[PDB]
Paper text:
HG3.17 was evolved from HG3, a higher-activity mutant (S265T) of the in silico design HG2 that was engineered post-design to reduce the active-site conformational heterogeneity observed by molecular dynamics analysis of HG25.
Use of our HG3 crystal structures with or without 6NT as the design template causes similar, but less severe, structural, and energetic effects. To evaluate the effect of restraints imposed by the diffraction data, we generated an ensemble using unconstrained molecular dynamics starting from the unbound HG3 crystal structure, and used it to optimize rotamers for the HG4 sequence. The better predictive ability of the HG3-derived ensembles prepared using crystallographic restraints likely results from their lower deviation from the HG4 crystal structure (≈0.4 Å), which we previously showed to be necessary for an ensemble to represent a physically valid model of the target protein fold.
Numbering used by the authors:
A (entry chain B), B (entry chain A): 4 to 303
Write the structure that this text describes.
Amino acid sequence: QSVDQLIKARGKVYFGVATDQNRLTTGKNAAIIQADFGMVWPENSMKWDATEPSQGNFNFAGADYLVNWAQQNGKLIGGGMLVWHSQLPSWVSSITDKNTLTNVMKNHITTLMTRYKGKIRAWDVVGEAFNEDGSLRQTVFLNVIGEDYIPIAFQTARAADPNAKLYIMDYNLDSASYPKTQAIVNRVKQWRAAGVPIDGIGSQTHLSAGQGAGVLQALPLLASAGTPEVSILMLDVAGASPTDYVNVVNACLNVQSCVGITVFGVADPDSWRASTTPLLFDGNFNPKPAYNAIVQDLQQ
Amino acid sequence: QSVDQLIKARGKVYFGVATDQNRLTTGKNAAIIQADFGMVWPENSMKWDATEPSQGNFNFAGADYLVNWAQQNGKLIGGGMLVWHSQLPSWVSSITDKNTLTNVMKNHITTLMTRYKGKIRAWDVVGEAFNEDGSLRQTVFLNVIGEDYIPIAFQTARAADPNAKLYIMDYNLDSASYPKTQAIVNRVKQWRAAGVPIDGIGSQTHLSAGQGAGVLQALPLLASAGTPEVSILMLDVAGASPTDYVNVVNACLNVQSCVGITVFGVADPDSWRASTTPLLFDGNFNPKPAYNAIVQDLQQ
């Protein structure tokens, strides 16, 4: 039974999953995504070291495959990250000239978004821009361009595909009392009041056992930044307890601006932290109790 | 225990496995490969749709990753397929001029091989070139260029990297009485007598329960073509019976020119036919009975 259908029935946009070409051609991933999920997200195939490994040499084969598969099968598509310090090729982090890096950043955004113009529901334009204390992370982009790199990236992205929702993304936004959570709210409010086109906050939710409950307060706080959308992104939960997963889903239902949830893979052995069996299907592609508890929660 | 260490002790070159970047960053695949396998073969990253999706414009991000991982961890590397009708961009298959397709084919081979010159033990230069009845498969290469496309491919390959072993590969070479088995032997003997540098036949061994016994007669028949090497490539066996797998390993051991065996993935859920559970590790990354039977067989 399909959690995407059930969550749409509750007024949300999607229940989604990260995937890529070799997932869709192995295992039972393609069948499960067709039946049970409404949106796909590139596991790796749109990050910077995958898509522009040297200057101007774009690698689009993998993303092309995912985009075509999604369209053929009637699924929504997300993408990102456009601007991110991890998985950043050395040729970008070596740049010290402000104008050069500004144009490199603008060209990377514009080329990716233009290739799939109109087909991508939402992009994470900037990711992991905050330190844990809430100050801005001192990446090459902050150090060289300055604080306006975030305004410039969103402005550039809006011009490239005016139809896409533009998100800022970060992790460790799972507790309301955490400084990072409050800082991103305060900065996003101030950017949007200055005209920066930030449509969404995406919360990359990687939880330990028992941390689902805290998202019931954190997600409302993120929503108070006033963005039209917020999302739960790349969700997984060590142990995959029903309680944790149901708490996260209910946080999504409780927050009007929360458009949906994306889990970080289908089956446990294909997780980046597989020994914590943190996903909704087991190594035999059977649904786990957490999957069934979500169905039951969404039916009510 | 490492099947690769054990097969090396019986005088063979490797026990290998197919993999790629997102396998190495998820599950337990990297740790099992480090401990137990001696060679890696790209699941997808070196095929034509991934490496030359528009004419003359090459994508190497995924393949570079695999080659660097392998070098860092002391593993042999295989590559392919260079010339293959599947996963073939439509810009190639719509060429109708013989000289243009020949140059396109030569440019694809030379670029890939030159980039990793000296780092790749063996290349599958041509794949799946035969029909089941033993005639040559009518691909764009055969139709536009003619049967000379296979000599041209290998000659070009030998010039691009003289240190690499050059292989032709095909499937359903698993029975000594099947027409396709004798047919590839016939043609390889004739090509080699004409000076075509075919160093190896790679037998893409995808078996159903009970077919391992036939490989004991088929692989020596393949070896009668006189190539320096033969190999078992992309091995998997529906049901993963110890008896089938041991029979395949013993065929390798019995054939002087068989240099090793490559299995088509690490764990069952990541197989292209996962429902047949055809690999040596299960969905929790535990070694299966077939793995332990291979260990015992290699120690006898």
